[PDB]
């Protein structure tokens, strides 16, 4: 339920992230792996060692998808149509894991960029990530 004032903060806050989005996504992926060990079961062949290239590579594509979603904030389900099918129909990722990644991503943004995370921005960026998780998991069964 992103209000027009809520989307303005999301676009502005994501803009201040800049080119460091790919590294932020990679750090969040690594942060969630060690903090929630059960999450590693969904990555069978990926190397889970700290600083791995695949983790860095995966973080870049995850942040790429989110940055695409911000530019298409009005129409999210179409911009995330391919990812929704892969995450729900192929890998059958449980929806509980998405709230873990969203929390870890917010922590990474808050720690690395503390000055811009006013409480107004925190709520707006939280609602944006909740919208992404629901879209991806809306066809889980």
């Amino acid at each position: 339920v992103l209000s027009p004032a809520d989307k303005t903060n999301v676009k502005a806050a994501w803009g201040k992230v800049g080119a460091h989005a790919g590294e932020y996504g990679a750090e969040a992926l690594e942060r969630m792996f060690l903090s929630f060990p059960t999450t590693k079961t969904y990555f069978p062949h990926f190397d889970l060692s700290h600083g791995s290239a695949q983790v860095k590579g995966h973080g870049k594509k995850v942040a790429d998808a989110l940055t695409n979603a911000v530019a298409h904030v009005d129409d999210m389900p179409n911009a995330l149509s391919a990812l929704s099918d892969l995450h729900a129909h192929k890998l059958r990722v449980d929806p509980v894991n998405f709230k873990l990644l969203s929390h870890c991503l917010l922590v990474t943004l808050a720690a690395h960029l503390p000055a811009e995370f006013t409480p107004a921005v925190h709520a707006s960026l939280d609602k944006f990530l909740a919208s992404v998780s629901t879209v991806l998991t809306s066809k889980y069964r």
């Binding site: 303005t8 999301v10 080119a19």
Partner: protein, 416 residues
């Protein structure tokens, strides 16, 4: 999101998005900059000369800089070309001072790399955005240190002169080392360094002398790239300037033949022209000569010559080329006491005239398994080495005798 074609009388006539929507932020307020073209100026500040330093832009009396996010070697080239310095080599520069910081910035989206000036290539933003994560833009054009050899009789020798900005000056011997001389010969495309001479051997120079002493690694492709450190001025007298001789000091010409790709071989040494000896003129040396002449690859060398011996004295120079070196200077040469060449035995070559595909290891092949001799103090003696696959190997000394080494000396061309 106003999308004007470029000819509408007013902006409201253009097709633009609604007065709402799109969730814009007040830091994204658009602006314009209209100018006659004479107020904008580009300068380099903070470096040794005008061709290296931090990029500084002065537009409408307002000072500013250029952000690094879109910077590349293509954009570095167009800026150096506009200043008239030359090509761009390094995107970093060695600092001689500190430049004042400025809040205003200039941003480059993309630049084709062949434009005349920086202003011409599309969508350069002047102010309105900040890049704190990014940093300043630095360049180092190729006119920072341009070397030149003056007053040498042979083509690739003379007094060393280095250009700073738009002025010339000589370099003292103490500043110039062997590693610095190798870069200078490579930069000038004169080959590798053969020798270095000091004490104004080539001649007594004239003008002002630089103070800084070059401290380069040795394999830099340009003089400007290697770091330098300033030194006190006047420590070297004018008679202490340096001279450099590079390896490509040979001048060999094809004559009598209507097409430059064919004719009798002529060599100029000791200040006179002379024909080359027919002996020891094989295909491998022929390819290098035609490569020097820029004719291209060669496929045939005449057995004898219809062109004649010529009026000049018969040169007894013999060359031992591997077949891959570009110029005849890089080929090892032996001429001390070479056997006399009869009058009718004069060398010649018939180059194709096509400069394509050069030579590839396998006709027109660089060959494989060529033996080399190392640590022997010369090219005719040393430990035997065999090139197999991509490695060099030796031979066990057992069952090795004169009859066994007779073939090796013959293949290398040394003899017995």
């Amino acid at each position: 999101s106003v999308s004007c074609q470029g000819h509408e009388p007013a902006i409201w006539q253009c097709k633009h998005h609604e007065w709402g929507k799109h969730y814009c932020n007040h830091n994204e307020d658009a602006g314009v900059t209209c100018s006659d073209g004479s107020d904008l100026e580009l300068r380099l500040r903070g470096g040794g000369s005008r061709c290296a330093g931090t990029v500084e832009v002065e537009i409408q009396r307002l000072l500013g800089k250029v952000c690094d996010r879109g910077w590349g070697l293509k954009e570095a080239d167009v800026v150096c070309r506009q200043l008239g310095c030359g090509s761009a080599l390094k995107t970093s520069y060695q600092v001689y001072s500190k430049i004042q910081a400025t809040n205003t910035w200039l941003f480059l989206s993309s630049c084709n790399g062949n434009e005349t000036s920086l202003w011409d290539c599309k969508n350069w933003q002047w102010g309105g955005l900040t890049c704190d994560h990014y940093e300043e833009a630095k360049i180092t054009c190729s006119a920072h240190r341009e070397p030149r050899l003056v007053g040498g009789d042979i083509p690739c020798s003379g007094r060393v002169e280095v250009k700073h900005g738009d002025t010339w000056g000589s370099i003292c011997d103490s500043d110039f080392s062997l590693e610095a001389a190798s870069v200078l010969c490579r930069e000038l495309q004169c080959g590798t360094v053969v020798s270095i001479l000091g004490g104004a051997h080539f001649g007594e120079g004239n003008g002002q002398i630089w103070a800084e002493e070059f401290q380069c690694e040795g394999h830099e492709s340009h003089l400007s790239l290697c770091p330098v450190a300033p030194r006190p001025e006047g420590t070297c007298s004018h008679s202490r300037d340096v001279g450099v001789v590079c390896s490509r000091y040979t001048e060999i010409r094809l004559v009598n033949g209507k097409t430059p790709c064919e004719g009798r071989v002529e060599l100029k040494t000791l200040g006179a022209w002379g024909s080359l000896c027919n002996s020891h003129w094989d295909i491998e040396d022929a390819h290098v000569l035609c490569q020097q002449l820029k004719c291209g690859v060669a496929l045939s060398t005449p057995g004898g010559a219809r062109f004649g011996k010529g009026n000049g004295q018969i040169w007894r120079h013999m060359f031992h080329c591997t077949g891959t070196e570009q110029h005849m200077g890089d080929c090892p040469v032996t001429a001390l006491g070479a056997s006399l060449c009869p009058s009718e035995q004069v060398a010649s070559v018939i180059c194709s005239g096509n400069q394509s595909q050069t030579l590839s290891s396998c006709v027109a092949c660089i060959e494989s398994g060529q033996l080399r001799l190392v640590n022997g103090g010369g090219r005719c003696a040393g430990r035997v080495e065999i090139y197999h696959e991509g490695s060099w190997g030796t031979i066990c000394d057992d069952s090795w005798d004169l009859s066994d080494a007779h073939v090796v000396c013959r293949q290398l061309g040394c003899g017995e």
